[PDB]
């Protein structure tokens, strides 16, 4: 669904964008991984009543057999199917995906 695909942005910049106080918990973006070539990253804003605003990063790996996954047991045939899925069920993530990060 493209608006949430931010491509080549750094971890630092994704955190700057996501840690905007006005974003609801579960605001997210998908970007390329800086450190693991060929992997993507799902970056999500989260709240802890201790840490407060913070961002969790979930590496999205590509199976050679083709699929995408964050945890081994749940694989997806595309990034857009993975985003639709975690927008409905948190299923291991800190929180379900809610808003697409602005811009």
């Amino acid at each position: 669904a493209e608006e949430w695909y931010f491509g080549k942005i750094t971890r630092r910049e994704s955190e700057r964008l996501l840690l905007n106080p006005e974003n609801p918990r579960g605001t997210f973006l998908v970007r390329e991984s800086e450190t693991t070539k060929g992997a993507y990253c799902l970056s999500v804003s989260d709240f802890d009543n201790a840490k407060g605003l913070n961002v969790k990063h979930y590496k999205i790996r590509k199976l050679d057999s083709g699929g995408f996954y964050i945890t081994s047991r749940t694989q997806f045939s595309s990034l857009q199917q993975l985003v639709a899925y975690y927008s409905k069920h948190a299923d291991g993530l800190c929180h379900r995906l809610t808003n697409v990060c602005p811009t």
Partner: peptide
């Protein structure tokens, strides 16, 4: 990154 298996 959250270390996920």
């Amino acid at each position: 990154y959250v270390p996920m298996l």
